[PDB]
Short mmCIF file of C-alpha atoms in Angstrom, two decimals:
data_model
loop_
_atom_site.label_atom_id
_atom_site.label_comp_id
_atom_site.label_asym_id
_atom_site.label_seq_id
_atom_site.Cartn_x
_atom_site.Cartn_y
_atom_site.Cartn_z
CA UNK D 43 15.66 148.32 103.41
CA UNK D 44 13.67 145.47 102.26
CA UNK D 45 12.23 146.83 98.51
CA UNK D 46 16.11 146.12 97.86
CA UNK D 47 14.65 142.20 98.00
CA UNK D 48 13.07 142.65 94.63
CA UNK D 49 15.47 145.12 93.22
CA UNK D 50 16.73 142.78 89.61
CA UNK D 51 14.00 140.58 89.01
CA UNK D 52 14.25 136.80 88.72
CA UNK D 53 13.33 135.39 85.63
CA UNK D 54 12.82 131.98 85.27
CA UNK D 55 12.02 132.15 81.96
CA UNK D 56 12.25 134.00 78.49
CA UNK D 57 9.08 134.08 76.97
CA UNK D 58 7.19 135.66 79.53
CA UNK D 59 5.55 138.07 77.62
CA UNK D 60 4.09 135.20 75.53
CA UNK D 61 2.70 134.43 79.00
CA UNK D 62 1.13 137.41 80.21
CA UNK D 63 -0.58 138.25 77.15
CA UNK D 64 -2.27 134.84 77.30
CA UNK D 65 -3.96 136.58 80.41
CA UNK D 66 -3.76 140.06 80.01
CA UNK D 67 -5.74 140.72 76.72
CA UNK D 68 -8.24 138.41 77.77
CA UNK D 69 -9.05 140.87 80.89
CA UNK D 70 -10.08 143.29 78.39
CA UNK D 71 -13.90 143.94 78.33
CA UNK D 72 -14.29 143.11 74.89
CA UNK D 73 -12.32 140.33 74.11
CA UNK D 74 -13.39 137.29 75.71
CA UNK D 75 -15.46 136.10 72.63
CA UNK D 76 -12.62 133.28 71.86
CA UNK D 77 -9.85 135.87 70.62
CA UNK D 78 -7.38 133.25 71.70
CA UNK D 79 -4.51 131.76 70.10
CA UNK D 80 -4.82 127.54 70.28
CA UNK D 81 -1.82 125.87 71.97
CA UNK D 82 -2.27 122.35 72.04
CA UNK D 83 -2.11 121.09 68.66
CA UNK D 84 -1.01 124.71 67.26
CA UNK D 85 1.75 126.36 67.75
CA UNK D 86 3.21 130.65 67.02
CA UNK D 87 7.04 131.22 65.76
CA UNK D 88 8.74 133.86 68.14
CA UNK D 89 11.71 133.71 66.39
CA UNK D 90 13.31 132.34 63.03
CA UNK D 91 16.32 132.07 61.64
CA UNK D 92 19.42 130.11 60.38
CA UNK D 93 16.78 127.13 59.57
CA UNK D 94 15.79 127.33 63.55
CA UNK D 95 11.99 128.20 64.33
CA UNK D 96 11.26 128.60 68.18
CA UNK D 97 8.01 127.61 68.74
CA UNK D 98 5.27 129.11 71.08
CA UNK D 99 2.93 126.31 72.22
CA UNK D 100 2.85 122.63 70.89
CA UNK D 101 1.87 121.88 73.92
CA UNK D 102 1.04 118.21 72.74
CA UNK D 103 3.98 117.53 70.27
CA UNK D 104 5.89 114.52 70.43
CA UNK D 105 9.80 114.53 69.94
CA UNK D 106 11.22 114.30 66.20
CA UNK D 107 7.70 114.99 65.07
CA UNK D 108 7.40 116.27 62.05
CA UNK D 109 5.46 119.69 62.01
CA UNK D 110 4.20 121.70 59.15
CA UNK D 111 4.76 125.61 59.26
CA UNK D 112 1.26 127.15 57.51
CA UNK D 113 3.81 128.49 54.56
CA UNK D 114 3.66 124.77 53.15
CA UNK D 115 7.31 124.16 54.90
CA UNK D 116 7.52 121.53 56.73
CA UNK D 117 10.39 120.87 59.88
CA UNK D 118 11.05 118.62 62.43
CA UNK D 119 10.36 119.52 66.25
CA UNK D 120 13.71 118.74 67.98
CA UNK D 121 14.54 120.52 71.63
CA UNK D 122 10.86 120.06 73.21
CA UNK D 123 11.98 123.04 75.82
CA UNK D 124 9.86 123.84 79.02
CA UNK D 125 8.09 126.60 77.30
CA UNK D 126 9.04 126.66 73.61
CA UNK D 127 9.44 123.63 70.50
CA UNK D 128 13.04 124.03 69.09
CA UNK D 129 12.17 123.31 65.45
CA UNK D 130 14.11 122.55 62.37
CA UNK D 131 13.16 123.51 59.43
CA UNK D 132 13.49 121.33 56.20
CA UNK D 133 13.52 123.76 53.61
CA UNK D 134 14.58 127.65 53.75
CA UNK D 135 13.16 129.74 56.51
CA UNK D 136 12.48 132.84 54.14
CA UNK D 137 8.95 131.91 54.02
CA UNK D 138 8.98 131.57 58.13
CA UNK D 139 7.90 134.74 60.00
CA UNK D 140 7.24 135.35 63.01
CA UNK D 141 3.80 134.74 64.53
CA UNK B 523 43.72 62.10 36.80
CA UNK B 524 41.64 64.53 35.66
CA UNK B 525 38.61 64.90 32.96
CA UNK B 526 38.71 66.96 30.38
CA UNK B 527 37.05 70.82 29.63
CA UNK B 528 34.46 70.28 26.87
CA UNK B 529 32.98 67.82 29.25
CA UNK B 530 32.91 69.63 33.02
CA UNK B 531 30.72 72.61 31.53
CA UNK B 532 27.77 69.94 30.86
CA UNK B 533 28.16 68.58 34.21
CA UNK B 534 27.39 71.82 36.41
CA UNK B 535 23.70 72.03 37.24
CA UNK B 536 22.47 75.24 35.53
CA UNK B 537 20.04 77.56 38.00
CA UNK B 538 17.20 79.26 36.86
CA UNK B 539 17.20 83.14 36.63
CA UNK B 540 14.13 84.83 36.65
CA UNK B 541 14.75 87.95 35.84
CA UNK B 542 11.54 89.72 37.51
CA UNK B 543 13.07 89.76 41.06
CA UNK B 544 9.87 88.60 42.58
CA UNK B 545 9.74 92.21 44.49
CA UNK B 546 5.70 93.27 44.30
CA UNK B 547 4.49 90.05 44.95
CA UNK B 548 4.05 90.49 48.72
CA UNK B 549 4.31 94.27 48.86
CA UNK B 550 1.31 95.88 50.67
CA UNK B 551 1.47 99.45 49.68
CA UNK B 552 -0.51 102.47 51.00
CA UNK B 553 -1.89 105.95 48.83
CA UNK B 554 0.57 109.19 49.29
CA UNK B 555 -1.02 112.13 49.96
CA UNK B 556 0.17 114.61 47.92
CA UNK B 557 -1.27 117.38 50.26
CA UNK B 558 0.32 117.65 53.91
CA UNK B 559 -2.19 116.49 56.18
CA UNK B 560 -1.79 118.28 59.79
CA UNK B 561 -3.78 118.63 62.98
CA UNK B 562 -6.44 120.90 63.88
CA UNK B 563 -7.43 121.94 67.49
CA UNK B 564 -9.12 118.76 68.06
CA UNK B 565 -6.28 116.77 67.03
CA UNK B 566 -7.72 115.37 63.75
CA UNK B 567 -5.92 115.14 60.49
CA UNK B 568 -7.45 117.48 58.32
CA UNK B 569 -5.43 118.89 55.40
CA UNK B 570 -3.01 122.23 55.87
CA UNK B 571 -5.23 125.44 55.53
CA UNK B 572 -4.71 127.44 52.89
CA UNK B 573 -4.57 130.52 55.29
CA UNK B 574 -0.58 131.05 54.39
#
């Protein structure tokens, strides 16, 4: 049998989803009129916690950069990973959600 | 053969203290922004939004 190939699916990655919806939700009819979340200078939290934000995107960020989350809290952007920003945070991550 | 110690406290050359440290003299300083000053889309520094 040679479906048994693709049986458990190799991931080479672990934010997928964060990449497929950056070209799925596009494909819909009426939402190519820039509903698009910026990457380059920008970036989404996927996760917080314990003073650690992952960051989607900041695509441009240098390493030990300071950032600035868009609660006021500001953190420093320290594991540049291949497709999240290990960030952290220089205050309390209360304030941090994410998104 | 030695002097005496009334006279050796006269003979030590006394420096001159200042006292104002001489510390802003030189100093080139530069205006804090209070406000945190982050980077739009097209990568200039534009102050943080006030979208929270």
């Amino acid at each position: 049998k040679a479906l048994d190939e693709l049986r458990k699916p190799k991931f080479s990655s672990k934010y997928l989803i964060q990449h497929v919806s950056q070209k799925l939700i596009p494909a819909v009819k009426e939402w190519e009129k820039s509903y698009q979340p910026p990457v380059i200078h920008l970036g989404r939290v996927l996760s917080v916690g314990d003073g650690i934000a992952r960051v989607y995107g900041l695509k441009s960020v240098q390493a030990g950069e300071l950032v600035c989350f868009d609660s006021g809290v500001k953190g420093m952007a320290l594991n540049l990973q291949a497709d999240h920003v290990g960030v952290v945070v220089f205050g309390n991550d209360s304030v941090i959600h994410q998104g | 053969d030695i002097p005496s110690l009334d006279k050796l406290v006269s003979e030590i050359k006394e420096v001159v203290i200042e006292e104002d440290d001489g510390l802003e003299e030189d100093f080139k300083a530069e205006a804090l922004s209070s406000e945190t000053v982050v980077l739009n889309e097209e990568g200039k520094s534009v102050p943080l939004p006030k979208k929270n």
